[PDB]
Amino acid sequence: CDEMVHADSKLVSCRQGSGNMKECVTTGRALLPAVNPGQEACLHFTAPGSPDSKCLKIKVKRINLKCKKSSSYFVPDARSRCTSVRRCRWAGDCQSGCPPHFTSNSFSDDWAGKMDRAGLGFSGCSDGCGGAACGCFNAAPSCIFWRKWVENPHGIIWKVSPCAAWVPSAVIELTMPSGEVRTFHPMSGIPTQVFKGVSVTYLGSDMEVSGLTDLCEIEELKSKKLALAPCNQAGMGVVGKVGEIQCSSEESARTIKKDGCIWNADLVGIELRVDDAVCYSKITSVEAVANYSAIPDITAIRGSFSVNYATCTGEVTNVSGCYSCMTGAKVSIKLHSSKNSTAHVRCKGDETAFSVLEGVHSYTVSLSFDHAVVDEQCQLNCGGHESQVTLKGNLIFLDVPKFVDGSYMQTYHSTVPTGANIPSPTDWLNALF
Amino acid sequence: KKDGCIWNADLVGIELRVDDAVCYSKITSVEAVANYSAIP
Amino acid sequence: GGVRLITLTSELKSATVCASHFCSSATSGKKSTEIHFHSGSLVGKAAIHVKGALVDGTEFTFEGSCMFPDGCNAVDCTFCREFLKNPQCYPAKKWLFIIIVI
Numbered sequence: 001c002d003e004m005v006h007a008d009s010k011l012v013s014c015r016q017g018s019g020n021m022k023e024c025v026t027t028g029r030a031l032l033p034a035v036n037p038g039q040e041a042c043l044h045f046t047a048p049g050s051p052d053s054k055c056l057k058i059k060v061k062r063i064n065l066k067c068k069k070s071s072s073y074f075v076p077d078a079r080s081r082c083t084s085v086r087r088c089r090w091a092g093d094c095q096s097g098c099p100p101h102f103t104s105n106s107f108s109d110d111w112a113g114k115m116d117r118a119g120l121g122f123s124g125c126s127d128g129c130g131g132a133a134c135g136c137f138n139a140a141p142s143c144i145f146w147r148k149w150v151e152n153p154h155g156i157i158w159k160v161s162p163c164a165a166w167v168p169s170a171v172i173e174l175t176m177p178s179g180e181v182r183t184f185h186p187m188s189g190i191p192t193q194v195f196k197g198v199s200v201t202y203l204g205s206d207m208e209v210s211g212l213t214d215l216c217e218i219e220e221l222k223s224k225k226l227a228l229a230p231c232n233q234a235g236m237g238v239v240g241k242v243g244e245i246q247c248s249s250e251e252s253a254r255t256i257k258k259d260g261c262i263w264n265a266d267l268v269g270i271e272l273r274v275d276d277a278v279c280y281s282k283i284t285s286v287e288a289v290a291n292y293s294a295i296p297d298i299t300a301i302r303g304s305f306s307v308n309y310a311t312c313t314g315e316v317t318n319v320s321g322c323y324s325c326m327t328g329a330k331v332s333i334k335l336h337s338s339k340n341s342t343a344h345v346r347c348k349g350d351e352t353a354f355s356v357l358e359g360v361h362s363y364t365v366s367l368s369f370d371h372a373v374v375d376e377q378c379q380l381n382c383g384g385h386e387s388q389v390t391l392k393g394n395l396i397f398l399d400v401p402k403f404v405d406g407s408y409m410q411t412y413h414s415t416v417p418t419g420a421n422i423p424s425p426t427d428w429l430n431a432l433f
Numbered sequence: 434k435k436d437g438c439i440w441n442a443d444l445v446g447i448e449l450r451v452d453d454a455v456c457y458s459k460i461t462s463v464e465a466v467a468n469y470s471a472i473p
Numbered sequence: 474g475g476v477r478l479i480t481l482t483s484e485l486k487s488a489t490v491c492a493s494h495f496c497s498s499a500t501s502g503k504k505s506t507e508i509h510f511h512s513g514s515l516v517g518k519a520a521i522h523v524k525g526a527l528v529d530g531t532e533f534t535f536e537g538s539c540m541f542p543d544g545c546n547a548v549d550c551t552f553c554r555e556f557l558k559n560p561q562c563y564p565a566k567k568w569l570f571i572i573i574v575i
Contacts, residue, residue, distance in 0.1 A: 036502060
């Protein structure tokens, strides 16, 4: 990590619970820049106590465009069905005048209490046939009542959530100084917060902005494929929008029992019949109803931490080569020591800080930098006054060492220089005259 | 402790979890939130 | 890799699943144009990248989970640079050959 800034050694709350291991607590906030993606950032810490030091690391993976979820919606597969109860006059004592009031949640005519496959289907009086041909022994119109079902035969449902905007985000991974590792969905444009471990982090700089149409996600629970819907949405449902049956219950997704799955009147269309009624659907599908497409300074806040409290070598070895490249060039370092401890900065490098955390045995480490000539003084890692030197020439966007064709071309580059100054001088003063 | 220190609703942002809830802050800091200067 | 957008690595699958899930990216800031394709068969993947590095080992599996390939590259290509070309030991016995027979 070429990018890292140490902690602040003035916020100190340490209690000496154990003599060997000092116990310390610190809080506050962090202000660090953000990298061009594809590396792992670090964060070093200090203490007024001399020996111990600790570090925290942050990984970055991707740059991508996603947005927040305002609210989630579910939509089953509505299908029209209906039943009609055929009642003759004077049987059941039919209301000669149909009462405008209806007990639509009971249906006292037919089984006042029963669970139904219906999203509260409405009922209406209808004028049926009358007479002996109708079999009602009376010329009075028949007495037919009716019910609507909104049902899903086989369950495929979608979680639906609108943003109507887009803000860039990234991928962030956490390394606890204790040793724990955590990642999440970071939303690095809007100040989203994550509350895990002990600390909290939030956005990076909004370098780039763009304009895009107000859209959403859509994807099957059985995962046919992701897609994109106009998805006009609200708590309620307007006519002709992307979701006409709004629900927030996956538990009541397949079957509809809870009233949370909401609807609107007379989406299912009725055709009257002499003996019954015929129900059709004015509802629309999930696809192509309005679809226009399918598939195409990171900083942190510090809470009350739990951060607590050697013999070494030079352990140096060879170098790799690159300069002026945004990644760098690695160097290998093969250490054995006596404590499971860390390393810290040097003088002469003038590039960045060390971020090395090792244990008690011969191990090796690799870290990437870039330079012209290799200088390396004053690495204070284990508390002892150790310094190491390596002399090497680093790779740059440099001449060709293989062909040396430039040495041939540049040698021939000099041509007719003095000749242009000799012949033109024969007509310099004369032309001026 | 005193209610004299006043606030506004839902400055601290909540994320729901299956067993618990996760709280983050939409609040801002003391510096650079809109600052355009320090000491002349 | 580097400034240019396209590389060539041969990726192979012993896979029969209906569809490959989300794979991941390479190092050096790679957002590919494809990390999923049909995966029920034995088909190779000629992946393009932006890396232009040497080690050529990075984490990239729907489920491969950080396999390590290997790479080795030369140093010769078109050179568009900024700083001075070269400082060498021409002064001792090679600067005398600078002025030649024109």
